[PDB]
Amino acid sequence: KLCLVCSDEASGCHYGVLTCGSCKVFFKRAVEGQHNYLCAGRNDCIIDKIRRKNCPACRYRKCLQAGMNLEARKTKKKIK
Ligand SMILES: [Zn+2]
Ligand SMILES: [Zn+2]
């Protein structure tokens, strides 16, 4: 039911894991601009619906932690 990064209701399977549409596009836009996200804190920001925008670094590390990857979407559009 819930996005694995930010805990809002999931929308589907994107880049291998169950996510909302918002984290789908964050991650898409992150790997396309290869952004230098750094965390001003101690890498322990809460990532939830209200706070996810506060620290793209910490939200980025969560997608990785939850196992998103560009490898999944490439292969899934080739299988199709
Ligand atoms: Zn999310
Ligand atoms: Zn942070």
Author numbering: 419 to 498
Authors' text:
Here, we have solved the crystal structure of the GR DBD in its DNA-free state.
The GR DBD crystallized in its free form in space group P1 with eight molecules in the asymmetric unit. Within each dimer, one molecule shows clear density within the C-terminal helix (H3) following the core DBD, whereas this stretch is mostly disordered in the other molecule. In the free state observed here, H3 is rotated by approximately 60 degrees so that it would lie across the minor groove of a bound DNA. The largest differences are located within the lever arm region and are similar in extent to the variations observed in GR DBD bound to different GBSs. In the free crystal structure, His453 is flipped out in all molecules.
